[PDB]
Design a protein around this ligand. Structure first.
Ligand SMILES: [Mg+2]
Length: 110
């Protein structure tokens, strides 16, 4: 059954007002037994966010489709609270998929 296999079923990271645009939050990785190249994508239908994050629901992160590197794409502010939760797909050239869960906590700061 040649198909992508994510290394982990859950990836997590914390962001705060101390972070800057471009920070690498985590690196998603799936293996494929036949060496078929993997594309990584956020499933925007799975994106669930704290009400305070509604404005940055679509812009908070970028996922590089080839590297699996998730980057912070906004400057967190003192008015941003709670969690982002979403699913990421790994798709091989034949269209076979795996899924993994991602949680990003907005960490309390002074
Ligand atoms: Mg699976």
């Amino acid at each position: 059954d040649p198909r992508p296999v994510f290394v982990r079923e859950l990836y997590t990271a914390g962001i705060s007002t101390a972070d800057s645009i471009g920070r690498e939050l985590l690196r998603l990785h799936a293996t494929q037994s036949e060496g078929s190249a993997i594309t990584y994508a956020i499933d925007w239908d799975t994106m669930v966010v704290d009400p305070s994050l509604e404005a940055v629901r679509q812009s908070a992160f970028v996922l590089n489709a080839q590297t699996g590197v998730l980057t912070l794409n906004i400057q967190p502010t003192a008015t941003m609270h709670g969690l982002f939760k979403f699913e990421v797909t790994a798709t091989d050239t034949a269209g076979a998929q795996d899924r993994t869960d991602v949680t990003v906590y907005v960490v309390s700061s002074q």
